[PDB]
């Protein structure tokens, strides 16, 4: 079998992308944040909390003949940004892109955090990191890639995300006029159930290239990239009158600059992100300062290959027995 489905930036600046996702019987279609990075399937529901609800789509399992309450099975999760939610568990079917899986667990939230109540455009999320990090207790739950892998025709899916436009996840096959070029595959470590991979360096503008392993995550959940200090330094360095404020928390950048391009090895490859797609707009409304899409990731422990980088490439994540991360320009 396979899948197809298309994702749609929340916003103008892309700060998240959705994708619709078909829930029961009948179908109850929530536009989910499909995450990389994470590894529950959650959604906004008729037992989250009203006072927490603000625009969003719910999943009401009672409405569905193929939902069936887990029982026992509890669930709570902290997010990087420091968001979270927390809820109880269904099994159901869910179904993306035409590919269906039966006995997905569907974790309702009865609570969630401020950032996910005032995000009306997102309805909960589809984590396709591995099913190690999945926080269902005491029984732990497959991820919804997981569940659908032996009956895809190949054992991969694709993130495809637009630059302010739409684009595709695929699920069980590789389009092959989707990219430009070949597909450089590089390894993964699954030690701390992430996507985990070594990039080989990164060039700043038309600047030389530095061969230098920069060991992070291919995150779609993730907005902006995430670098080591020295690197990201390096690139602000190129723009006029950018600088690093403690106030707003990251690098921002006259909104007049035009803004160089950051090329990330995979390999022998090179996948170069254009100046645009590190621009994320005014701090706040009206302001001439704007905030940059590359971000250090010191103190968060880990760097992160979030969509700034993503939606530079066509990218297969390769489930296979030993898993890969494939990459292509576009």
């Known amino acids: 079998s396979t899948g197809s489905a298309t994702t749609t930036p929340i916003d103008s600046l892309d700060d998240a992308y ?10 109850q279609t929530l536009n989910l944040d499909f995450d990389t990075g994470s590894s529950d399937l959650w959604v906004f529901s008729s037992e989250t909390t009203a006072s927490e609800v603000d625009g969003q789509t719910i999943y009401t399992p009672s409405k569905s003949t193929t939902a069936k309450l887990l029982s026992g099975a509890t ?16 099994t159901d079917t869910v179904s993306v892109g035409g590919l269906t899986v039966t006995g ?9 955090s401020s950032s996910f109540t005032e995000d009306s455009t997102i309805d909960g999320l589809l984590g396709l990191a591995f099913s190690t990090l999945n926080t269902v207790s005491p029984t732990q ?14 054992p991969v899916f694709t993130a495809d995300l637009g630059y302010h436009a739409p684009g595709t996840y695929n699920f069980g096959f590789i389009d092959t006029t989707a990219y430009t070029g070949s597909i450089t595959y590089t390894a993964v470590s699954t030690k701390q159930g992430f996507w985990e991979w070594t990039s080989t360096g990164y060039a700043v503008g038309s600047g030389t290239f530095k061969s230098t392993s920069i060991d992070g995550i291919a995150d779609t959940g993730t907005t902006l990239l995430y ?10 360095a ?13 690098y921002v950048f006259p909104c007049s600059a035009t803004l160089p391009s950051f090329t990330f090895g995979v390999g022998s490859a090179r996948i170069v992100i254009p100046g645009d797609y590190i621009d994320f707009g005014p701090i706040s409304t009206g302001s001439s300062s704007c905030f940059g899409g590359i971000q250090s990731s010191a103190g968060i422990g880990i760097n ?20 890969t991360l494939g990459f292509a320009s576009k």
């Open 238 to 250: 190129q723009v006029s009158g950018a600088k690093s404020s403690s106030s707003v928390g990251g």
């Open 304 to 323: 992160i290959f979030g969509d700034v980088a993503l939606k530079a490439a066509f990218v297969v994540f390769n489930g296979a027995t030993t898993p």
């Open 141 to 154: 739950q497959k991820t919804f890639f997981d569940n659908a892998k032996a009956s895809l025709d190949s």
């Open 104 to 112: 997905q667990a569907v974790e309702s939230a009865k609570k969630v």
């Open 227 to 236: 670098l080591p200090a020295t690197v990201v330094s390096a690139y602000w």
């Open 18 to 27: 959705i994708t619709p996702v078909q829930i029961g019987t009948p179908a």
């Open 75 to 90: 669930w709570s999760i902290s997010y990087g940004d420091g968001s979270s939610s927390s809820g109880d568990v269904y």
